[model samples]
Target: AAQTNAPWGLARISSTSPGTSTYYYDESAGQGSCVYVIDTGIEASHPEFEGRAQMVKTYYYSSRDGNGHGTHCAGTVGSRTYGVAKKTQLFGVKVLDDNGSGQYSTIIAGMDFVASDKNNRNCPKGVVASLSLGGGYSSSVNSAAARLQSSGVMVAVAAGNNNADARNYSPASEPSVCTVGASDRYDRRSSFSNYGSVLDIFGPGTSILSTWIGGSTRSISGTSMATPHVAGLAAYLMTLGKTTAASACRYIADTANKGDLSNIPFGTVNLLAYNNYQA
Candidate 1:
């Protein structure tokens, strides 16, 4: 129902300097690695995704929207058509149902699954995680996130969608995850984006057109869209350098767009910052 029609539609994928395909040609989009996304299910059949990204693992917890939140999230992070980092492998962890609701426990279960992967360490290709869901951070959440961080897997989460206030929640609030906040193409905070010192970085999250079910396109809103921008960037960094949580965070942070906050104490996020910094 939230579908849009067009060949060169304007999604975050199209917003890049040239475009998705051209972006990948840069020889620095993604280092041919793997990233696990913890969310709904992925639409592996979507044209933008077919043969481009693969699901290395899958788990089920809830059921709701027969539409495509997970598919959209996955494309944003891993789709080759317009995704920021399109060359990385993807692991689909369906913790949230199609309806966009999930519990902290389900997330823990998904993390448990990631932890249990035997080759998780020697993943020759490398591994990063994109988490677009949110709830509240608990000891269980913190503990699981810490374990993942210590294990060398970088986690990225949405900073939440509360219109105002700086309170981000859950795994996003956890220090272990790369807490990503939403920003408009203009690099300004969305009126709906939650903000706070805990906020890690910002990325294009508004008016993002990407893969949906049945080979369709749709525009979605939320830090859910922005979270993957960081996820993709993380994977790119991992391939550019090596897979280490500290290095990933530092690369993303040092290179993010430092916008109006230039006068302030915090930092700004810009996609170009990463590419230029990488160069």
Candidate 2:
């Protein structure tokens, strides 16, 4: 179990009982793995990151996040105070505009950047990418994500918040990527989360607390928030020797607590992510 206090989202993942208040972590869960946050960009200057996060590419004007979405996701993956994988390296791939929207071309460029990153060359331990933003189906973005997965990066993407079948969405519907849906502290699927066979896993998403811009913390909700937990979990699993995309995905699925989530609609996988931690 972790020594520090935990947010509800963090607490829920490591336990089967919904009411538990502690988060279980190995402390050194993701030491060397890198997680690229492909969203509106991250506020790398946030104190929570403690210099672990930096910007690698920006499709917008500046590297800093004008919107807080990316920074929040980055924090969930690797921030000092709120991270799931405390020691994972983090990079900001600013693909979306400040309004949290972007073109498919820009998003693909960011994903492609991670695939072509110098450190990714022949690295057996592999890497992770958090695609916590998504829109309608696009074969172009879907193909780009497939390339990233083939390059050995575990891609965790959002299953949209549309309260409809996730199959209608792009990168979320992309079979090559792991699509994550939203669940709450009580193990109930979030009403706003998209469902369907396209969803690969569920993670705590409601009222998730994470680092924000201006060096502050905020509570927000979305499948976007859920995906980062899967992202950080993937990094941790990779560090534990589930080093390839296939191995990492299989390990998580096998280890997840199965068929216990509430309000899970038909087609969504009922596996709730776990860290092999117990109280």
Candidate 3:
């Protein structure tokens, strides 16, 4: 069960103690499911992606991930090497620009596409959306995210890195999506991660390494990084017959490592994301 070759963030999620190295996941490993990384874009040829990653949808002119945020997030979600779910299909919906930014209309276009895609067809099993971008409150964006979930897509969003109340954020505060906070390998709340009662759970975010824009790898930190880890976990749960978005979210919370984090703020859930690998 020891995969010492993995990034510490990926490894830490599967074991409660820091001594545990590498990630250990369930047998499903997110097979038969797909994760829509709603962000800048993805480097489909990143060696870690193993050709499973692609830019399936895009609102902007460019089809490549110039900022590398989406590529990194996608790697954490389902890359063969750094992924939480090694087998899940990776679809990048380019909502944000190369600079890692986007408007409500552009972002909603990506969400709408994912929601519509799931409603109209099948994805082998369940569908998951990994959203790592957001700014101030926007009812339009919140409703779009909620609508996407209502259409049967399991959505996991970042609890903005402002270190403020998550309730003040749009999609993060949206009742339907799962809000994920950030934590370091030490199991402490990430200093910049937004918190409060609105957050659904925490995941490894700091100093996390994953795929970059040039078929290489890189490490960065943010609530953005944490969201995809939980999204990958959702994909893993999806393969276990938890087909409904609500049920998958429920399962994620029910199986998390509770009372094991440090420096948690008032009202923030003290649970850490887990992959349900019982060793």
RMSD of each: 5.2, 1.7, 1.4
Instruction: State in Å the error of residue 56, model 2.
Output: 0.6
Please give the CA lDDT of all the candidate structures: 0.63, 0.85, 0.87
The 10 consecutive residues of candidate 1 with the worst lDDT sum are 1-10
**Residue 72 alpha-carbon offset, candidate 1, angstroms:** 0.9
lDDT of 1 by residue, 1-279 (tens): 011332122232233342222232235546567777777777676778757555445444333225587778778776766576666776677777667666777778888777666264344445778888877546787678767766667778787887533343677667666777776655457667776666777666777767786678788888888887778777766776644555676667765545532212233233322443311
User: How should the candidates be ordered by lDDT, best one leading?
Assistant: 3, 2, 1
Q: What's the TM-score of every candidate structure?
A: 0.81, 0.95, 0.96
Clashes of each: 8, 0, 1
lDDT of 3 by residue, 229-248 (tens): 99998888788676456677
RMSD of model 1 against the true structure = 5.2
Residue 60, candidate 2: Cα error in Å is: 1.5
Winner on TM-score between 1 and 3 is 3
Candidate 1 residue-wise lDDT at 214: 67
lDDT of 3 at 120: 49
